[PDB]
Amino acid sequence: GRYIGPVCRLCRREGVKLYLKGERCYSPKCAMERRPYPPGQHGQKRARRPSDYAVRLREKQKLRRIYGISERQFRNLFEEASKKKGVTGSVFLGLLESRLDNVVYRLGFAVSRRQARQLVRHGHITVNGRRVDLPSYRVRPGDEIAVAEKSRNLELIRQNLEAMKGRKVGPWLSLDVEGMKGKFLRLPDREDLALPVNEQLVIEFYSR
Amino acid sequence: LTDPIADMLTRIRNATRVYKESTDVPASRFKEEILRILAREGFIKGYERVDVDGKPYLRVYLKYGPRRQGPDPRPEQVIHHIRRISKPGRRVYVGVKEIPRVRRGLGIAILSTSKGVLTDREARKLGVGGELICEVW
Amino acid sequence: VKELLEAGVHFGHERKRWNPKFARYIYAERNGIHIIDLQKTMEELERTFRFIEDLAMRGGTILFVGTKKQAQDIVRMEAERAGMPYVNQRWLGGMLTNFKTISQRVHRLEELEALFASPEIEERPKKEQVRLKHELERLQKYLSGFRLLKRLPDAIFVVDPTKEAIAVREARKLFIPVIALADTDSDPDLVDYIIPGNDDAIRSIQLILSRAVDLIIQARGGVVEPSPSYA
Amino acid sequence: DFEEKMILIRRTARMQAGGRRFRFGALVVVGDRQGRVGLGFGKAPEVPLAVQKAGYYARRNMVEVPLQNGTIPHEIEVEFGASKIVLKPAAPGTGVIAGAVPRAILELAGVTDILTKELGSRNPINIAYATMEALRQLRTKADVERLR
RNA sequence: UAGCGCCGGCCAACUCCGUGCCAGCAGCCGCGGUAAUACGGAGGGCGCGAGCGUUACCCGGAUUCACUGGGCGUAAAGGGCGUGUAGGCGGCCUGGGGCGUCCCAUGUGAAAGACCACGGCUCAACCGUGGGGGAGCGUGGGAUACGCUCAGGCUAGACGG
RNA sequence: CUGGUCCACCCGUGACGCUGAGGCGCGAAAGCGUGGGGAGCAAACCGGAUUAGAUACCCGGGUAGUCCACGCCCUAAACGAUGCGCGCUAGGUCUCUGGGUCUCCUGGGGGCCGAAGCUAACGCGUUAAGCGCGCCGCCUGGGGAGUACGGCCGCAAGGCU
Ligand code: SF4
Ligand SMILES: [Mg+2]
Ligand SMILES: [Mg+2]
Ligand SMILES: [Mg+2]
Ligand SMILES: [Mg+2]
Ligand SMILES: [Mg+2]
Ligand SMILES: [Mg+2]
Ligand SMILES: [Mg+2]
Ligand SMILES: [Mg+2]
Ligand SMILES: [Mg+2]
Ligand SMILES: [Mg+2]
Ligand SMILES: [Mg+2]
Ligand SMILES: [Mg+2]
Ligand SMILES: [Mg+2]
Ligand SMILES: [Mg+2]
Ligand SMILES: [Mg+2]
Ligand SMILES: [Mg+2]
Ligand SMILES: [Mg+2]
Ligand SMILES: [Mg+2]
Ligand SMILES: [Mg+2]
Ligand SMILES: [Mg+2]
Ligand SMILES: [Mg+2]
Ligand SMILES: [Mg+2]
Ligand SMILES: [Mg+2]
Ligand SMILES: [Mg+2]
Ligand SMILES: [Mg+2]
Ligand SMILES: [Mg+2]
Ligand SMILES: [Mg+2]
Ligand SMILES: [Mg+2]
Ligand SMILES: [Mg+2]
Ligand SMILES: [Mg+2]
Ligand SMILES: [Mg+2]
Ligand SMILES: [Mg+2]
Ligand SMILES: [Mg+2]
Ligand SMILES: [Mg+2]
Ligand SMILES: [Mg+2]
Ligand SMILES: [Mg+2]
Ligand SMILES: [Mg+2]
Ligand SMILES: [Mg+2]
Ligand SMILES: [Mg+2]
Ligand SMILES: [Mg+2]
Ligand SMILES: [Mg+2]
Ligand SMILES: [Mg+2]
Ligand SMILES: [Mg+2]
Ligand SMILES: [Mg+2]
Ligand SMILES: [Mg+2]
Ligand SMILES: [Mg+2]
Ligand SMILES: [Mg+2]
Ligand SMILES: [Mg+2]
Ligand SMILES: [Mg+2]
Ligand SMILES: [Mg+2]
Ligand SMILES: [Mg+2]
Ligand SMILES: [Mg+2]
Ligand SMILES: [Mg+2]
Ligand SMILES: [Mg+2]
Ligand SMILES: [Mg+2]
Ligand SMILES: [Mg+2]
Ligand SMILES: [Mg+2]
Ligand SMILES: [Mg+2]
Ligand SMILES: [Mg+2]
Ligand SMILES: [Mg+2]
Ligand SMILES: [Mg+2]
Ligand SMILES: [Mg+2]
Ligand SMILES: [Mg+2]
Ligand SMILES: [Mg+2]
Ligand SMILES: [Mg+2]
Ligand SMILES: [Mg+2]
Ligand SMILES: [Mg+2]
Ligand SMILES: [Mg+2]
Ligand SMILES: [Mg+2]
Ligand SMILES: [Mg+2]
Ligand SMILES: [Mg+2]
Ligand SMILES: [Mg+2]
Ligand SMILES: [Mg+2]
User: Which intervals hold domain S5 DRBM (chain D)?
Assistant: First the structure.
């Protein structure tokens, strides 16, 4: 399946902060906050000139690892968007964010997509009323996403819920809080999320 | 001689490199009809039907770019390029849909047609095609 | 001031050692030697000078370039009239393309001017006198009136461009307008402002060079009439 | 100031009795990403010397690239002795698609969208030189209609 | 349940022992002869992920059979030289025909699939619905620049006095 | 006895043209057959020397062959390692042969340096290797190999493919 292994090693090797769990990634107990150098026996050694390839290799994994998606699942969409109209970048981006799990986390239902998926994969979520244990469902504009009424009685949801009431949600997002029923408004533009990514670099990558 | 057209074109391309105020060619209504295009688009200055020791000609009056500094001050060419397309060795024929657009729109291709010589654009406007005479810029 | 009577001073020469690019500036060659169409000769004069004065009334510099034994001497005249840089002897390569380092060879000269200006130890072993003094007379031979050029010229002037294609080359690269006189043999095109006339008849050399300077002073502050002139 | 990029560096060699004394070459470009770029070639008895020397040239041999939207105006095709370079107009979503040498050269020129291809002696040196004057030969509707 | 490939360059990923042109890896250039980032093991790391690798074969890179789109002085390639059949090709001007050639209309060009839109299995893969074209050739009409054909002139190629 | 070729006059025919897979003919030397011829020279051969050896380089002899006639043989560094025709693109100096008006101008060949341009460089450059059009031959890593097989040619050695 997805990754599911040691994760901090991601942020480190990348040299950037990926808030892959939730709270700690903000805490001063973080790795990059403590050890922002490569994992393994050779982290603190002077890095050397990465290759033009190696570079383009990064941005990918960085993004790819950000959502924890199989390489394949990350070819399709970018074969999707690339064969999709207009600027392949924005589309693929919107194609990625359009995943349930993500949006679920983007809707502050869980600190990590990792949680998002599980709650998603555990069907605790719903959409337009319908229940969806499908962490790969490409949610489209006009979709009503509702927590499982059967799981509205859970406390974790509310602890993440509570820490959301008036929290700032994406322009292409709402969050009728309490009702545990958000909503997915539109497809974003690059300027809608300033990810630590240079998407074109990933374009250059599969251009091989 | 095989193809006067390329020869015509060739004569031009041969002088433009040496920067001739003009040059000559044996005459033919077709060669002229061509040349007709080649000033209305602005690559030449125009032609006049001259006449050499008894024989007709077409002294073409040549247009070039401005003097320049650097070490190579020689004036850039108007007709950067001019090469034959359809030939006696390989006659080349196009339908209106398959009519190329020279150098993204900066050049043209002279076309012989049932409705007179045209440019890559004039044909598409008139909705026809024909024997691609040449492409030039 | 262009006169016109010049016809009795140079009116061209040089055999079939000509240059094909020069024919538009020739009417014939009745004496087995090309003939310069003094008409267009004016037309360039009427065009070239229009460039000269302009630089003058603008404050730019002009560098004179003439190394023939013919024009060996006239150079130091009309130049020093105009009081501007000049290159009488050898044309030191890179004299423009490599200015920053050429020029740095004049401080050595000016410096020797300081020292040899006197004391600061004449207690230097006699071997060191004569030798520098010699090292000075050389530095002086070549640099005398290019020591004047403390920055890159806004243009230059040339007697024999084919002779000074070296000179001609470095400017053409540096975008320094190049004006000069030439006869048959030289390559026009290579010139920026042209005085197609004889390049060995001092008599004709002085004519141009002299009058050229006149439009310097005539635009460079004041006026004067006669100048030197060996018969 | 501008932005510098090192396409290549190589150690040459000269034969003298008692050994083969060396010398390094530096391929260095430089661009603002707004119409201007430069490519000199550096040589110096040691690595960083040549790089810096090159940059001095790289900024003494410039050219003005009439970009449009991130691509170029017209598809250019130039041979440098043996190396032949192909430059084609691309659209926004595209993204530069060229070898390192051209890419490195084209990228600092600001181009976001271009189709390319090296042919023949794709020696990075010559492929570069030809790459430049390919740009040194790009033109505009204005430049066109100007001459006409 | 976590397994596999890889870590000298290409090509992302490093050190330690054993060994000592031996036992070995190898797709190419090449690794090893007592300080191996190149074998083996281990630590660690890189990439995918119920997959991972290898072999085989096809296209790609191969612009290396080159119509797009290559080339023959010395790198492989001008026939030893001529004459001449078939064939390919063919200078200026006028007219007829309308073969190539071009335009429009029109019938066929089944459906499946490919491509865009959307709809059902909780997604996707899969499948359904509608939409949107062509080349190619059959039928009718038209235009005549270039190619061709039939006819009439000319003299700038050739032949001749 | 005969061919090709050039210049002038600009008299005649009026595109009659270029190229040319096949085919055909020519094809230096050596070599073959038949019949002559045979001074000089000269493969093999003998001898004398140099060498460690010297079936060679140098020397003394010397047979075919080199010469003529008629037949074959058809290869080569048969080279400009550059196919043929035409048109376009600065010139300078030398030389062959023509025509003029005789300073010089113009045609056709033979060399040289060089405009731009080409070219991987050395180099070419109105005798292109430059910009072009037509047609033929030809190349597709090295060796194996111009070998094997088959077919054709040949008296044979051997040639072509
Ligand atoms: S945010 Fe911090 S704690 Fe979280 S995965 Fe990244 S480095 Fe580790
Ligand atoms: Mg796209
Ligand atoms: Mg691809
Ligand atoms: Mg074609
Ligand atoms: Mg002179
Ligand atoms: Mg250089
Ligand atoms: Mg190659
Ligand atoms: Mg290579
Ligand atoms: Mg411009
Ligand atoms: Mg692997
Ligand atoms: Mg390995
Ligand atoms: Mg190593
Ligand atoms: Mg890989
Ligand atoms: Mg590496
Ligand atoms: Mg292994
Ligand atoms: Mg090797
Ligand atoms: Mg060891
Ligand atoms: Mg799977
Ligand atoms: Mg293959
Ligand atoms: Mg590729
Ligand atoms: Mg291809
Ligand atoms: Mg090739
Ligand atoms: Mg060879
Ligand atoms: Mg030959
Ligand atoms: Mg025939
Ligand atoms: Mg015809
Ligand atoms: Mg007709
Ligand atoms: Mg027809
Ligand atoms: Mg169908
Ligand atoms: Mg659906
Ligand atoms: Mg369908
Ligand atoms: Mg289609
Ligand atoms: Mg159809
Ligand atoms: Mg029809
Ligand atoms: Mg007709
Ligand atoms: Mg025919
Ligand atoms: Mg007729
Ligand atoms: Mg004639
Ligand atoms: Mg004749
Ligand atoms: Mg007559
Ligand atoms: Mg008649
Ligand atoms: Mg023939
Ligand atoms: Mg023979
Ligand atoms: Mg013989
Ligand atoms: Mg016998
Ligand atoms: Mg016998
Ligand atoms: Mg006998
Ligand atoms: Mg005898
Ligand atoms: Mg003997
Ligand atoms: Mg013995
Ligand atoms: Mg003996
Ligand atoms: Mg012996
Ligand atoms: Mg004897
Ligand atoms: Mg015999
Ligand atoms: Mg015998
Ligand atoms: Mg014999
Ligand atoms: Mg015999
Ligand atoms: Mg033969
Ligand atoms: Mg010879
Ligand atoms: Mg010859
Ligand atoms: Mg040969
Ligand atoms: Mg050829
Ligand atoms: Mg005579
Ligand atoms: Mg001659
Ligand atoms: Mg030469
Ligand atoms: Mg040159
Ligand atoms: Mg070429
Ligand atoms: Mg000749
Ligand atoms: Mg032939
Ligand atoms: Mg082989
Ligand atoms: Mg072989
Ligand atoms: Mg043989
Ligand atoms: Mg046999
Ligand atoms: Mg044989």
Answer: 2-65
